Protein: Bromodomain-containing protein 1
Amino acid sequence: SMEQVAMELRLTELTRLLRSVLDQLQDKDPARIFAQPVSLKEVPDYLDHIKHPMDFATMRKRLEAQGYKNLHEFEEDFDLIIDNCMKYNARDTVFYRAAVRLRDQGGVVLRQARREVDSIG
Structure:
């Protein structure tokens, strides 16, 4: 149907905007602390602590399959990256600190993304 096509065009365009948002958030992680999944070879107990691992590479795979239907879904995964790190790592660690700075800097990007998603529809 033509409606299904219109819907798919909206999803494509959301994907475009979320790709740009993802790039911008990932620039706020210049250390690349969040770039890849925590290695279960290197942290064998990780899943005993963290039930839903997340990282920027995993988000990108979902994004490119158009697997984010709305901005809320995408923000859920970004918040997992941050929140997983702040639980596993102590306050005095470069990992925790990196997550705080990513959260704070990312907030700015996400605030305007929400306005754009609403504005463009």
